[PDB]
Amino acid sequence: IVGGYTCAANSIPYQVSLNSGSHFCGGSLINSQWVVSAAHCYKSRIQVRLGEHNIDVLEGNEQFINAAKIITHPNFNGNTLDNDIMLIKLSSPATLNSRVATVSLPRSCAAAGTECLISGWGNTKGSSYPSLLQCLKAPVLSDSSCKSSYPGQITGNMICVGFLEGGKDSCQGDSGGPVVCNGQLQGIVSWGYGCAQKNKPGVYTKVCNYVNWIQQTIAAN
Amino acid sequence: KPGKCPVTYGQCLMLNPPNFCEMDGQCKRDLKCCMGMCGKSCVSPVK
Ligand SMILES: [Ca+2]
After folding, report:
1. Could you give the number of structural domains in chain B?
2. Does A190 qualify as catalytic in the annotation?
3. Which class is domain A1-12+103-208?
4. Of A27, A132, A182, B8, which residue has the fewest beta carbons closer than 10 angstroms?
5. Is residue A84 among the annotated active site residues?
6. DSSP for B2-16, written as a single string
7. Residues near ligand 1 ion, CB 5 Å cutoff
8. Residue B38 and residue A25: Cβ atoms within 8 Å?
């Protein structure tokens, strides 16, 4: 997160870290046993870390739970990043206290201008990862804006969230993390051209298109 | 292999994206090993 602020400790209880030796992606806890992330964050072995604030210091609050299964969207295109969504089943459920909670799926897609919270442990510039969870308030942008910034590359499954002036954006290491608007998961950190560049807002998987796929996939697993 | 890697424009927001190949010889048929939006993979060459 470039241009954001350090979150209050544990104020984003649905935010997870995906770890396979170190943090590499974010994720969103949507029920006690299921995390939603980006398909491009796929690894054959993942440990999910819940309750985190300082990813580099055990603060007591953490749950460390391995992934038992990992299901990428069947139509994921690794070359265009269309359908950039995956689900992770925890090998045992997380305990839901005040420091680990679920986030709701959307009831519908967010209107342009809806104000959202984006979070993660990605770079805050060069690099590198901050220790403490970062936070950034940002609005959904019109499809029109999104496609002027990235002509030909925005599918029906992508939304742009942020500022066209730049300065404020998700960055490398925020991949797979949440965009939450009026208490609903609306975006998954996916891609962009650099970070915080002018007319290059972040591109996000449009989670509202996947509500049924999420429920169906969970139902079958 | 003959041809160029395609021009790309975004990058996935992962620091160390996955590489599914290191050289063209690891790619079937006329496919090249190219950095894309998210790491290296076998893709069709351009002109
Ligand atoms: Ca910690």
Report:
1. 1
2. no
3. mainly beta
4. A182
5. yes
6. -SBPPP---EES-SS
7. A 52, 54, 59
8. no
Q: How many angstroms separate the Cα of A155 from the Cα of each of A23, A44, A204?
A: 29, 27, 11
- CA atoms of A4 and A137, how far apart (whole Å): 8
If DSSP codes are grouped into helix, strand and coil, which group holds residue A69? strand
Sign of the torsion formed by the C-alpha atoms of A162, A130, B37 and A110: negative
Alpha-carbon span A106 to A129, nearest angstrom: 29
Q: Do B10 and A203 touch (CB under 8 A)?
A: yes
Dist. CA A94–CA A101, nearest whole Å? 9
Q: In this structure, what are the phi and psi dihedrals at residue A211, rounded to the nearest 5 degrees?
A: -60, -45
For residue A74 the two structure tokens come to 């069947």
Closest residue to A191, CB basis, from B10, B15, B41: B10
Binding site annotation covers A52? yes
A13-102+209-221: which CATH number, 3.40.50.720, 3.40.830.10, 2.40.10.10, 3.30.1330.30?
Answer: 2.40.10.10
What does DSSP assign to residue A4? Answer: -
Q: What is the DSSP string of A13-40?
A: TTEEEEESSSEEEEEEEEETTEEEE-GG
Q: Which amino acid is at B28?
A: K
Alpha-carbon distance A157 to A75, whole Å? 11
Q: How many CA atoms lie within 13 A of A136 on its CB side?
A: 30
Query: Taking the domains of chain A in order of start, what are their residue ranges?
Result: 1-12+103-208, 13-102+209-221
